[PDB]
Structures are given as structure tokens and as C-alpha cells.
Design an enzyme around this catalytic site. Sequence first.
Site, short mmCIF file in Angstrom:
data_model
loop_
_atom_site.label_atom_id
_atom_site.label_comp_id
_atom_site.label_asym_id
_atom_site.label_seq_id
_atom_site.Cartn_x
_atom_site.Cartn_y
_atom_site.Cartn_z
N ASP A 154 -10.95 6.60 13.28
CA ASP A 154 -10.74 6.42 11.84
C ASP A 154 -11.17 5.04 11.31
O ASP A 154 -10.47 4.42 10.50
CB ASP A 154 -9.29 6.74 11.46
N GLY A 161 0.81 -1.22 0.00
CA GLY A 161 0.00 0.00 0.00
C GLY A 161 0.84 1.27 0.00
O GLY A 161 1.94 1.29 0.55
N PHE A 209 0.53 8.81 4.02
CA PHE A 209 1.05 8.25 5.26
C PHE A 209 2.47 7.71 5.10
O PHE A 209 3.26 7.73 6.05
CB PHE A 209 0.12 7.14 5.78
#
Length: 331
Positions: free
Chosen positions: A141, A21, A25
Site C-alpha cells: 500500500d 486524520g 480506517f
Amino acid sequence: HLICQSGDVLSARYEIVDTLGEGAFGKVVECIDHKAGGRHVAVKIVKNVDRYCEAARSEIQVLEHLNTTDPNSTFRCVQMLEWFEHHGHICIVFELLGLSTYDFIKENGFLPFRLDHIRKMAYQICKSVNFLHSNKLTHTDLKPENILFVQSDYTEAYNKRDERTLINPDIKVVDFGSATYDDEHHSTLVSTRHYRAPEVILALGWSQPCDVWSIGCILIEYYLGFTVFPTHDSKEHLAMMERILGPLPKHMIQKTRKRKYFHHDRLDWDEHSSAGRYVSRRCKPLKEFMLSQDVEHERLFDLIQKMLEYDPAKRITLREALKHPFFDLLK
Ligand SMILES: CC(C)(C)c1ccc(C(=O)Nc2cn3cc(-c4cn[nH]c4)ccc3n2)cn1
């Protein structure tokens, strides 16, 4: 990509073999842990942004606490194995999981999960987040991308086209970088838009109930295969809420500092606008989204409607949610 290519043995222990991924971030990579005998792990390489160093610090702290209270992962929080610094970045090592629940729906032609699978996943999500809540924590989140399957293996069968069916629907919860303790500093903007509670948008103060809202939105997305809040704007989000759940409570509108969204304590929504027409044709009352009127479908939507109660003080708790008749079939 400069310091996270394949073959790299990060901190002389972790051989990168894949990237799983990528985003603002940083990156999540699959690694071989040679000092753990080639066992595959996930490593989160955190961006050198201040915001994400702070989130990384906090995720380490939260998971050290949670993995210590629940070492067997009975409540299905992802296990943090260790953390270090390498090339100026913070790296967090986790047990390797499979495809996110979002990724799976996506890769399955946006087909929703079967109801028996939703019941099990919903139960596991509620158990996990209830555990956080009992430990004076709010995740903030929660979303399909942060609910990961333990195993992504599936069987394939022709149904239109081939259907993918999970061999194991079990999940774990990830991304504790935004997790917040009761007694600690609360950010005003929390959650990804599609999943934030009304009290968050209106900046009315939030705590554990805002997780319950997010889960309510996740369950709808598991049931439909798409979001019922397809927006990137706060006021439009509120308008979508009003069309799906009914008008906001007046007392909540009177208390909010977010005057920009309102006019005379009613949502300042222009129905002659392009946005207005878009909301009118995309959204409808919650119960109209139901695919069947059978008992267990009615039970899921009863639970969902309770989870999407506007007033966080009235909203069902996860403790109460776990006692809902929808979960009876698990016995
Ligand atoms: C299809 C196949 C190639 C088999 C595949 C796809 C995706 C993944 C995967 O995405 N795995 C994955 C992502 N993870 C994120 C965290 C974490 C994020 N934030 N905090 C913690 C922890 C563990 C973790 N595992 C693994 N295999």
C-alpha cells in the site's frame, strides 16, 4: 467523535490535543504522553470494523518485528511505541511525524518537488522498502499519503505566488496494516487503485515487485504534482497504462483469469466511448511528460520506466534501483 474529543486522557496516559486524520480506517490523533513527559505522539484509533482489526493486528506484528531489527530506524520505518485497547477500540501509538508528501504538494498549490529533493526522497523510499523486502515483506500500500515527512517546517518565498520549501525533506514510511509476508496469505486486491501493479489488477499473483511499481508511480507524482493514472476503474486503468507504457505483454494477458477486460487477448477498450476519449486526451507516452531533457531528468525517467516494467519478473529490484546513476549525486 463520541470518544475522541479534545482533552481526553485515553487509557489514563494520553491526552488528546488534536485530530490529524480521519477515514474508514478510524482516526489518527495527536496526543501528549504524560508518562513520557508531555512528548507529542500520534495515536491511531482503529475502527470497530473486522477488516481494520485484522489490519491493526498485523501492523502491530510487522512493526514489532521491524522496530526490533532496526531500533534506530536506519531504514526509516515509522516507530511503533506501544498499543492498547480503550473503549472497545485498538489504539496504536507511533512517534509523531509531520505532513504526508501528498498533503505537502496539495498545500503548495500542487507544485511538484524539486529534483534534488526527489533524489533524496526516492533514495530514502527505496532504502526503506528494500529493507522490508530483505525481511520477506511486501508493503502493498505504498502511496504519497503513506510517505510522511519527519518535519513539515518550510520557508516561504515569492516565485505567480509564494513557494513553500521544505527545511528538511527526510521521510518515513507508514501504514503497515496491509504488509504481507512471503509465506502468508495474499489478498487478491491490494493497493489503492492509482498505485497497483498490472499483476495485481490481473490477479496473476504478486510479491515484492508490486511495491517497485507503486514507487514508480509515486516518483512520477513527485515530479509532476499530479497522477498520470487519474481513474477509478480497472479496465480504464489498464487502458491508461497501454497509452503511457505501451500494450500489455501477450503472455500476461493469456495467463489472467480476468477475461472480462479482454477480447481475443487484446484489451477490450472502446475508443468511441466517453471513457475512451477521456483516456486519449489525458494520457500520452511516458517520456512526453518530461519537463527537461537534461541528464538528471533523463536519469529519473530511465529509472521510472524500469520500475514500471509490466512483467514483475523482469522489473528492476530495489537493490538494483539503489545502484541507478540517478542516485550518484548523493555521493
Ligand atoms: C501541519 C501540522 C499541524 C504540524 C501536522 C500535520 C500532520 C501531522 C501528521 O499527520 N502526523 C502523523 C501522522 N502519522 C501517521 C502515522 C501512521 C499511519 N499509519 N500508521 C502509522 C504515524 C505517525 C504519524 N504522524 C502532524 N502535524
